[PDB]
Design an enzyme around this catalytic site. Structure first.
Site, short mmCIF file in Angstrom:
data_model
loop_
_atom_site.label_atom_id
_atom_site.label_comp_id
_atom_site.label_asym_id
_atom_site.label_seq_id
_atom_site.Cartn_x
_atom_site.Cartn_y
_atom_site.Cartn_z
N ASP A 253 0.82 -1.20 0.00
CA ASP A 253 0.00 0.00 0.00
C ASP A 253 0.85 1.25 0.00
OD1 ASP A 253 -2.66 1.37 2.14
OD2 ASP A 253 -2.31 1.46 -0.04
N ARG B 77 0.23 9.20 0.52
CA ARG B 77 -0.71 9.30 1.62
C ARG B 77 -0.34 8.34 2.76
NH1 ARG B 77 -3.06 5.31 -1.96
NH2 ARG B 77 -3.48 3.60 -0.48
N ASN B 78 0.55 7.39 2.49
CA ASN B 78 0.98 6.43 3.52
C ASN B 78 2.41 6.68 3.98
OD1 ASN B 78 -1.06 3.51 2.55
ND2 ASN B 78 -1.45 5.30 3.83
N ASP C 262 1.36 3.20 7.75
CA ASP C 262 0.15 2.42 7.46
C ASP C 262 0.44 1.01 6.95
OD1 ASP C 262 -2.38 1.49 6.97
OD2 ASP C 262 -3.01 3.14 5.68
N1 LIG Z 1 1.81 8.60 13.52
C1 LIG Z 1 1.11 9.57 12.92
N2 LIG Z 1 1.50 10.85 13.09
C2 LIG Z 1 0.79 11.82 12.50
N3 LIG Z 1 -0.30 11.72 11.73
C3 LIG Z 1 -0.65 10.43 11.58
C4 LIG Z 1 -0.02 9.33 12.13
N4 LIG Z 1 -0.65 8.16 11.75
C5 LIG Z 1 -1.64 8.57 10.98
N5 LIG Z 1 -1.69 9.93 10.83
C6 LIG Z 1 -2.64 10.69 10.00
O1 LIG Z 1 -3.77 9.86 9.76
C7 LIG Z 1 -3.87 9.56 8.34
C8 LIG Z 1 -4.36 8.15 8.16
O2 LIG Z 1 -3.41 7.23 8.71
P1 LIG Z 1 -3.37 5.70 8.18
O3 LIG Z 1 -2.96 5.77 6.77
O4 LIG Z 1 -2.59 4.84 9.09
O5 LIG Z 1 -4.86 5.36 8.28
P2 LIG Z 1 -5.71 4.10 8.41
O6 LIG Z 1 -4.93 2.87 8.17
O7 LIG Z 1 -6.40 4.26 9.69
C9 LIG Z 1 -6.88 4.28 7.14
P3 LIG Z 1 -6.69 4.13 5.43
O8 LIG Z 1 -6.19 2.78 5.26
O9 LIG Z 1 -8.00 4.32 4.73
O10 LIG Z 1 -5.77 5.24 5.18
C10 LIG Z 1 -2.47 9.83 7.81
O11 LIG Z 1 -2.49 10.12 6.41
C11 LIG Z 1 -2.06 11.04 8.63
O12 LIG Z 1 -2.65 12.23 8.16
MG LIG Z 2 -4.79 1.47 6.44
MG LIG Z 3 -3.45 5.05 4.74
#
Ligand SMILES: Nc1ncnc2c1ncn2[C@@H]1O[C@H](COP(=O)(O)OP(=O)(O)CP(=O)(O)O)[C@@H](O)[C@H]1O
Ligand SMILES: [Mg+2]
Ligand SMILES: [Mg+2]
Ligand SMILES: Nc1ncnc2c1ncn2[C@@H]1O[C@H](COP(=O)(O)OP(=O)(O)CP(=O)(O)O)[C@@H](O)[C@H]1O
Ligand SMILES: [Mg+2]
Ligand SMILES: [Mg+2]
Lengths: 280, 280
Positions: A140, A144-145, A158
């Site tokens: 992935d 955005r990740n 992520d």
């Molecule tokens: N450790 C961290 N520090 C700062 N911001 C964070 C963070 N972890 C996540 N975020 C914020 O949250 C967003 C989503 O995080 P993540 O990608 O892990 O989501 P998720 O797995 O909950 C959902 P999805 O798979 O749909 O993205 C990131 O793009 C960022 O903006």
């Molecule tokens: Mg995710």
């Molecule tokens: Mg994500």
């Protein structure tokens, strides 16, 4: 859920905060050498309307991070609350948000220099090289990740879809059905396989997102007709304000034939080479 | 996608608008009898970062809506653009938004009367009764999946997880893994089956959401701890200003034994009596 003392963190020492699903938080003594120091972290937990799959994904994410190990360009796993209560995966807080937002913020904030973009790319390659060496496939990879710390350090994040290279249902029709199509290697769909070379294809897309400063891949092309185009040899054009050499690297990552794509090892070498020249 | 004339709609007659993924749009001549009349509608389409599964779900949603047929308490399918372009599923536009938002915005400082609430529940029961007679299992019943029209007509929506009664793989570990846990019947996970009576359990939670005016089910209880508590006989408490009679109805939907739960027909008849007696 099994008790893993090594990573367990006290719930009473964790104070949930605002939203960043992920929330900011204050963890006391998360840094063992500073038993009384409160650290700002990020906590991932289930949503109220979470499904069973959302739960196994979060557990899987936690475990993948344990297996991987620590690395400068990989968001750090700090601890986890897994007993008597909701599952909390505690990771390092990145104050600059995700890469995609960061880049669009400083589009012509403090503008990005060509070298910055290269450093960014270099740092990510290093993380994937390490990740790959730990026999892990991310699946992935996308701007955005990627998270960016206060010191502008790139950190792959992520791990919600990450797997051990050996844990893949080879050839099953249900494999790789949840990977964002536009960052997906062709073989991932057509043959239902996923190797480290599949991750480098995604890295290619990530390079394009970076040099376009957070642009959206295959602009104007719906996911529905993307695979027919990819099969015919269609590839994204070169980002302006990007070197021909770097674009060639991107194209290399997008070679139809998986084994003809460079390895993360080779990518790091080439990027380091270019980075050193650009900064000399 | 196969050509399906009766449902196809000209892409040049549709003007996409703001977001509501779903967006509002104007469809010229969508109402055959009014060939030049533009109509406000809703359009569901893939996001730019959609997965293969998202696409199969959108297609599945569209096909389920064609098979169900029209009914007063079900969001109606109007047409679709499935050729030479991204898939668009055009459905009637519900001006009041989803039931959850609807009820919360009408909480005590346009309040909801007790009859309005009973009326809402009755309409939804009628809709589920019809659905069941069509051999359809929604599997994702919840206030956030109900739309309300300008005349406050309740409409069951989001058939993104709906299936024909025979299109469920009994006993497989992968079955029902994508259903929100707090609205899910125990047999769904424990036995890996899904019947109309599994939807009745969901209807029960929906009833609770309605009478709490858009409240969140099992407040304070994490999803990873819910099923243990349900096996121990735990059930949500009676919503304030809810009659013991309606509460008993909720409780009956939450019987552990599927066959001990009422059928949608029985629910319709009971709600009809309560509604009628309230009116008089
Ligand atoms: N450790 C961290 N520090 C700062 N911001 C964070 C963070 N972890 C996540 N975020 C914020 O949250 C967003 C989503 O995080 P993540 O990608 O892990 O989501 P998720 O797995 O909950 C959902 P999805 O798979 O749909 O993205 C990131 O793009 C960022 O903006
Ligand atoms: Mg995710
Ligand atoms: Mg994500
Ligand atoms: N026909 C319609 N008229 C008005 N609003 C609509 C609508 N269809 C959808 N919406 C709005 O969009 C919200 C989400 O719709 P829907 O339930 O179809 O989501 P979705 O299937 O795209 C994603 P998820 O499964 O996460 O909900 C609804 O709760 C409602 O507020
Ligand atoms: Mg929904
Ligand atoms: Mg849906």
């Amino acid at each position: 859920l099994p008790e893993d003392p090594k990573w367990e963190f006290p719930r009473d020492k964790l104070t949930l905060g605002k939203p960043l699903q992920v929330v900011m938080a204050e963890a006391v003594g998360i840094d063992k050498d500073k038993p009384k120091e409160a650290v700002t972290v990020a906590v991932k937990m289930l949503k109220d309307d979470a499904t069973e799959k959302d739960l196994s994904d979060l557990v899987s994410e936690m475990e993948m991070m344990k297996m991987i190990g620590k690395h400068k360009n990989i968001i750090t796993l700090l601890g986890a609350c897994t007993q008597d209560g909701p599952l909390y995966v505690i990771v390092e807080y990145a104050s600059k948000g995700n890469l995609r937002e960061y880049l669009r913020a400083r589009r012509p904030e403090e503008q990005m220099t060509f070298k910055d973009l290269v450093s960014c790319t270099y740092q990510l390659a290093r993380g994937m090289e390490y990740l790959a060496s730990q026999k892990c496939i991310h699946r992935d990879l996308a701007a955005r990740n990627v998270l960016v710390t206060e010191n502008n350090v790139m950190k792959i994040a992520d791990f919600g879809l990450a797997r051990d290279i050996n844990n893949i249902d080879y050839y099953k029709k249900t494999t790789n059905g949840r990977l964002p199509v536009k960052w997906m290697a062709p073989e991932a769909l057509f043959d239902r396989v996923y190797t480290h070379q599949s991750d480098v294809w995604s890295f290619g897309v990530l390079m394009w997102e970076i040099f376009t400063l957070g642009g959206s891949p295959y602009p104007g092309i719906p996911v529905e007709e993307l695979f027919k185009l990819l099969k015919e040899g269609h590839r994204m054009d070169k980002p302006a304000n990007c070197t021909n050499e770097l674009y060639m690297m991107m194209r290399d990552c997008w070679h139809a034939v998986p084994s003809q794509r460079p390895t993360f090892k080779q990518l790091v070498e080439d990027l380091d080479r270019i980075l050193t020249l650009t900064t000399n």
